């Protein structure tokens, strides 16, 4: 079996959060079903009705040190925007990558990213980057290139 986990976008801030549970559903004649979500590590008061098609998706993957090669210019990623009054995961696109040899601490690469919601730009390390799960494909391809 392979586990499938989800993240949901909050209407409060436009950031994405891990989903702990789906509590209820509601339907409209106009379409676009909504689901009531309990967010991981937040509890009942933060519960939200979420557009299933638009704002629920398979969870983004925090990157392993070796997986920086699957983070490419042009990609949408889920990026940790760490400020002083808030620190939240936002969609961003990778503009450029500065790839450097790894050391004892792992990946030393740096990524220039542009957040989708405000067009602001930031240089971030791999530890702030979450991969969309389909990029597993890339890694799989790479894995097939190894020696038997």
């Amino acid at each position: 079996s392979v586990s499938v986990e989800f993240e949901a976008k909050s209407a409060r801030d436009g950031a994405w959060y891990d989903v702990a549970a789906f509590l209820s559903h509601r339907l409209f004649e106009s379409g676009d079903p909504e689901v009531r979500v309990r967010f991981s590590g937040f509890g009942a008061e933060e519960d939200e009705w979420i557009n299933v098609r638009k704002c629920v998706r398979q969870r983004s993957l925090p990157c392993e040190a070796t997986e920086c090669v699957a983070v490419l210019p042009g990609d949408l990623i889920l990026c940790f925007q760490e400020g002083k009054d808030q620190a939240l995961y936002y969609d961003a696109h990778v503009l450029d990558a500065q790839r450097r040899r790894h050391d004892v601490g792992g990946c030393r690469c740096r990524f220039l990213v542009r957040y989708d919601h405000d067009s602001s730009e930031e240089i971030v390390p791999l530890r702030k980057v979450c991969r969309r799960p389909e990029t597993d494909y890339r890694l799989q391809i790479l894995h097939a290139a190894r020696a038997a």
Binding site: G41, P62, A87, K128
Partner: peptide, 9 residues
């Protein structure tokens, strides 16, 4: 694996 802890507002 594990995400960083979000802090709202």
């Amino acid at each position: 694996r594990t995400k960083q802890t979000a802090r709202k507002s």
